[PDB]
Structure formats: C-alpha cells, structure tokens
C-alpha cells in the first residue's frame, strides 16, 4: 500500500546522501593507489626496483615492477566501481523488500 510511496520517497534522498558514501568508499581505496603507482613511475625505474615481501626483499627490474602497478590498480578500479554502485540500488530495492516478507 504505502510501501512503495515510502520507498521512492526515501530512495532519491537516500541515494543522494549515499553518493558521498558511494564516492568515498571508492576514494580511500584509490587514495593509497595514488601513493604507489605514482611513486614508482615518476622517479627513475632504470636502476634496480625491489619488491618488498614478508621474509625477503625481492630484487626485480623495472620491467616486472612497472606493469604490476599499471594493470592491478586499473583492474581494481573496474571491480570497485561495480559493487559500491550496486550497493545503493540494492538498498533502494531492499527498503521495499523488508516491509513485505516479515509477517
């Protein structure tokens, strides 16, 4: 009856304020992406580019070290845009759903 009215009344206002929650959830992820792919590529990779791991500091050439930060961040950016975007519309629909089932 009033379940859709309260839903649509809520969703435009909920999505609106969730946009910051949406964009910030992507932000702090991309926040550390900035400290990494930048600091490697800007300064000369010509010399030896280590890999820092747990029980080892791995020796590596740029040739392996460079593309790792390239594609990984970019591959991450696809997936993060997907779910946080899908979270808002779920809340939109779940606000309509939770009033229905719980009799």
């Amino acid at each position: 009856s009033a379940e859709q009215v309260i839903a649509g009344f809520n969703r435009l206002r909920q999505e609106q304020r969730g946009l910051a929650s949406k964009a910030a959830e992507l932000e702090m992820e991309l926040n550390e992406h900035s400290l990494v792919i930048d600091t490697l590529k800007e300064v000369d990779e010509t010399r030896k580019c280590y890999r820092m791991v747990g029980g080892v500091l791995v020796e590596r050439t740029v040739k392996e070290v460079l593309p790792a930060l390239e594609n990984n961040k970019e591959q991450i950016q696809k997936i993060i845009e997907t779910l946080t975007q899908q979270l808002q519309a779920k809340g939109k629909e779940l606000n309509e759903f939770r009033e229905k089932h719980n009799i």
Binding site: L19, E32, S34, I37, R47, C49, Y50
Partner: protein, 132 residues
C-alpha cells in the same frame, strides 16, 4: 518563507564546513611528510657516507643491533604495494616529500563532491519541498 531558507541554510553549512575539512587535511598531512625528511636530513651526509653515526638497527621492534651504520649513499623507500625503488639520500628526500601531495590529493575530491553534493542537497530539497 522561512521554510525555504532553513532547508538550504543547514545543508550548505554542513557541506560548506566540508570545504574547510579537506582543505585543512590538505595542509594537515604536511607534518606527516616533511619530518620524515627531517629524519633523513641529519642522516644525510654527502661527500661522506650518509648517517655515519651510532644506531640501534631495527631488526624487529623488540630486536635491535648496535652497529656502525654508514651505508653507501642510498635509502630504500616504501613506495607501497610491494614496490621498493632504491633512492640515494636525495631522491629519498625528494620522493619522501612527494608523499605530501599524493595523500593530500586523496582528499579534496571528496570536498569537491561534498561541495558538489552540497549543491545536490539544495537543488533537490527546494524541488523536493515543492514536489512532495
């Protein structure tokens, strides 16, 4: 009407406050970054082995070694994500000052959004008051 100004007055003032927040966190990461350089600074020795000094090496937090420190000129710095490029005493300080803006640029994009959601607050609400 007092109805139209009240709805706008807070949503601006709430998200106008957001302008100062990241703008401050812009200038708020400066202390994080530059003292790290201050670490390297006294350490930095050119026309000498950098930091020719005492130390207790950090093997772990609980585990130190007193050694004669001086290395060949270099500082291996933490770039992030298992990427370590070597930096010699200077590129280090240079790279180390780079950690200023990169995380400082982690910020205003929300402030901008916050300011731009601020105008999404006001633009919606006036119609939202009229629509519903």
């Amino acid at each position: 009407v007092l109805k139209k100004l009240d709805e706008q007055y807070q949503k601006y003032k709430f998200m106008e406050l957001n302008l100062a927040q990241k703008k401050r966190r812009l200038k708020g990461q400066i202390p994080e970054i530059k003292q790290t350089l201050e670490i390297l600074k006294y350490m930095q020795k050119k026309k000498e082995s950098t930091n020719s000094m005492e130390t207790r090496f950090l093997l772990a937090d609980n585990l130190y070694c007193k050694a004669s420190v001086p290395p060949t000129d270099k500082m291996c710095l933490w770039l992030g994500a298992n990427v370590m490029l070597e930096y010699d005493i200077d590129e280090a300080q240079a790279l180390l000052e780079k950690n200023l803006s990169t995380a400082t640029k982690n910020l205003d994009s929300l402030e901008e959004d916050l300011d731009f959601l601020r105008d999404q607050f006001t633009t919606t609400e006036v119609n939202m008051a009229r629509v519903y």
